[model samples]
Target: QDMTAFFKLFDDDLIQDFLWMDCCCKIADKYLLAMTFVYFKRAKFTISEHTRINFFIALYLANTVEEDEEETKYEIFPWALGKNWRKLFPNFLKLRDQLWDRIDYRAIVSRRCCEEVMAIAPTHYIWQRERSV
Candidate 1:
């Protein structure tokens, strides 16, 4: 339904910088991120519920797909998070089960979209507010 509403489940200011992550990939704006959710729905997975976890799973699944084999096989989605992400693994598995068949892992988010989203929220981390840093 309202996919953009789903992506906003998390804070806009919070950018997850993975410690071991070297991928240049990142979600740009709520708009582009919402597109992932829309596609996820089109691909057949329902929203189930609007729980925060639902949106979180969408974010994780969206981030999981890649066009490159090098970045293809994904690690646990919560590994990018700073909290006790381990506890969330089971939920991710459940979400993945409903999602696996529908996701087109071959899809690649365009650099243009990423840049546009990043530009809209210019100076994201530049703010002295180190909330998640």
Candidate 2:
């Protein structure tokens, strides 16, 4: 699945800000948890709670690296996953699901409305435009 397609479900501004990072982190964590559970079940591997938590941290760190700006040069994945397996797996679905779930859809719409109203609020500079138009 194209996990990037899931971005369309969110308001663009929210995902682009630093303030929402924790919410993004939590969603990433949950998605990784669910996917790990499925994989271990299928493989018949005995998964411990610590193993799951470690997997979650690994996935979250991976998502952070992928989503980071190109200029930042912060390499967390190399330390987390080691050099050999960086590009071997795609975890986009887990990242995407976490991002989508982190968003408050209702609040996004509500905040958009408030922003629209504030954009047209009767500020001194805008008042002349308001009067002329």
Candidate 3:
């Protein structure tokens, strides 16, 4: 699928509408929200159950959601998905073999992949602020 076409299907307005129906959507940081919508737009997810929980995995992967706003004490905690992690894992894990080990969550979105997302949501001021609270 073309990138523009994929992005068009799940644009900012569409994402906002999706979030509006689900009250929990307002809780995440705008960029955090943006990254999830952006990444999901990259490939359609066939989430059947625990949909929100798995999308959160994308947040963790995107690095928008930290172990804490300040990682000075718990940087290790975020990547610390352990002990039967799969039972609580996102289907993104199924995208590749042992992909969990290959992940550098904090590097995924904020550090590297958002210009395209922000381009679509130019009105969002959240991206102008520091990534961490």
The prediction achieving the highest lDDT against the true structure is: 1
Q: TM-score for model 2? A: 0.24
Q: In each prediction, how many residue pairs overlap at the backbone (N, C-alpha, C within less than 3 A)?
A: 0, 1, 0
Clashing pairs in 3: none
For 46-105, candidate 3 gives per-residue lDDT tens digits of: 443214434445554444343344432122122324455545344434432222333422
Error of 1 at 11 (Å): 6.4
lDDT of 1 by residue, 1-133 (tens): 2434444444433334331242423332343354455545555544555455454455555555532232332443554334666676676667655655555543355656545444544443422222221
Between candidates 1 and 3, the one scoring higher on lDDT is 1
Worst 10 residues of 3 by lDDT: 71-80
Q: Judged by lDDT relative to the true structure, which candidate is superior, 2 or 3?
A: 3
> Least lDDT summed over 10 consecutive residues: which range in candidate 1?
124-133
TM-score of each: 0.41, 0.24, 0.36
Better of 2 and 3 by TM-score: 3
